[PDB]
Amino acid sequence: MENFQKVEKIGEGTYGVVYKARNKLTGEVVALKKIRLVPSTAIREISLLKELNHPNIVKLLDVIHTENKLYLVFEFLHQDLKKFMDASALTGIPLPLIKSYLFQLLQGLAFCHSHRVLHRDLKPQNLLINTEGAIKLADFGLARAFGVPVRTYTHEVVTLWYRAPEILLGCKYYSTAVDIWSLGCIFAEMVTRRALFPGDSEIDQLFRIFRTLGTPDEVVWPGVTSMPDYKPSFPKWARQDFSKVVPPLDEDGRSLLSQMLHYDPNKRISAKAALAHPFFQDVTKPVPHL
């Protein structure tokens, strides 16, 4: 905390304020995250993340716990995907770059998932990009450490847009499939230049999902009608063709996206199988203009 000079507020994250900072001694530029409460379970979970190192995962440099306050020190990246998508609304991200980013994000997932660590709150705001054509996932593993609240510490609404349907339907246990759902929602958003499912409450989110993909049933999703927040009185909507949902996307893309958005989490494609999908046959790594 005093080992760091604040350079600038980046924003108010899920768990606290996020700062760009400089290591006062070493001069290293880092992202400093304050985690508002701390519990031994959290400290032990966090420490395990220091080993979860991968080029597509923002590096956890240190955990500082002093005076019952908690700070996480990460590798700093200059830009996130949400700002990048906004900045390129006029023209859209070129497909070769969307493809490269999707490819790298799936690599990040495949790595963490193989160590059985989930993100659970993937969203454009925590996908970070550099001037080298790289993209990295920020805040991996934190949801398991600190929970995911409804409001941030500054009362901002945590988005539901990328939340998997099994969460919304009140599953007690999350699998890695929840991240593949979020990431498919982001893939669709990069392609169309519009969020796929911009829900503004849990039921609005669910009902937006049903409107596009069909109200799930026992045929598409064995066991769905027995989940805690499922109701027989949900309206029954018919599925739309993906040709209509993500129009410009080619047949490989639409086929991969559909597998990433399968209702049944057990059927939803894994990150590892997604990397082998023919969509990625001609993948390259362009530099974004930035």
Ligand SMILES: Brc1cccc(-c2cc(NCc3ccncc3)n3nccc3n2)c1
């Ligand atoms: Br607020 C908020 C919510 C979720 C993630 C981040 C965030 C942003 C960046 N940098 C992107 C950025 C930097 C400066 N200004 C805007 C965005 N970094 N870099 C390392 C971790 C990290 N976490 C910030």
